[PDB]
């Protein structure tokens, strides 16, 4: 199911954009993969994404309401775990996209 090729640079785990080995992250729904460096993930994000069932940007469903929803423009991605949320499904709901870093309700401490 996982495609052993990065969707952005077409390299395997043996050859990222700098021709160095780097493991692939793979979408659990469509199988598409990418190097974290090609996905522009930091190591923190990469390790946490390697704590869950990950979806690529095209398969991503809202973690609260469990659907992709109608508009692509109103989903934001957590800077800690890459989960997607509708603005309306945040806590509290967001009237406006924040600037800079944003962390989702799942990552925030109890």
């Amino acid at each position: 199911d996982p495609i052993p090729i990065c969707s952005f640079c077409l390299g395997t785990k043996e050859s990222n954009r700098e021709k160095k080995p780097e493991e692939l992250l793979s979408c659990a729904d469509c199988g598409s993969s990418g190097h974290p460096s090609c996905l522009k993930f930091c190591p923190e994000l990469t390790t946490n994404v390697k704590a869950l069932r990950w979806q690529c940007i095209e398969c991503k469903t809202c973690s609260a309401c469990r659907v992709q929803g109608r508009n692509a423009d109103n989903m934001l991605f957590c800077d800690s775990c890459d989960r997607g949320f509708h603005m309306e499904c945040c806590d509290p709901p967001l009237s406006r996209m924040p600037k800079g870093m944003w962390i989702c309700q799942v990552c925030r401490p109890k």
Binding site: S7, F8, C9, L10, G34, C38, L39, K40, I57, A72, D73, M75, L76, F77, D79, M97, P98, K99, G100, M101, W102
Partner: peptide, 16 residues
């Protein structure tokens, strides 16, 4: 915040 628009600009297009 990171959105589909910002993410696609940061990664660039998928390789055809």
């Amino acid at each position: 915040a990171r959105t589909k628009q910002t993410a696609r600009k940061s990664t660039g297009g998928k390789a055809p």
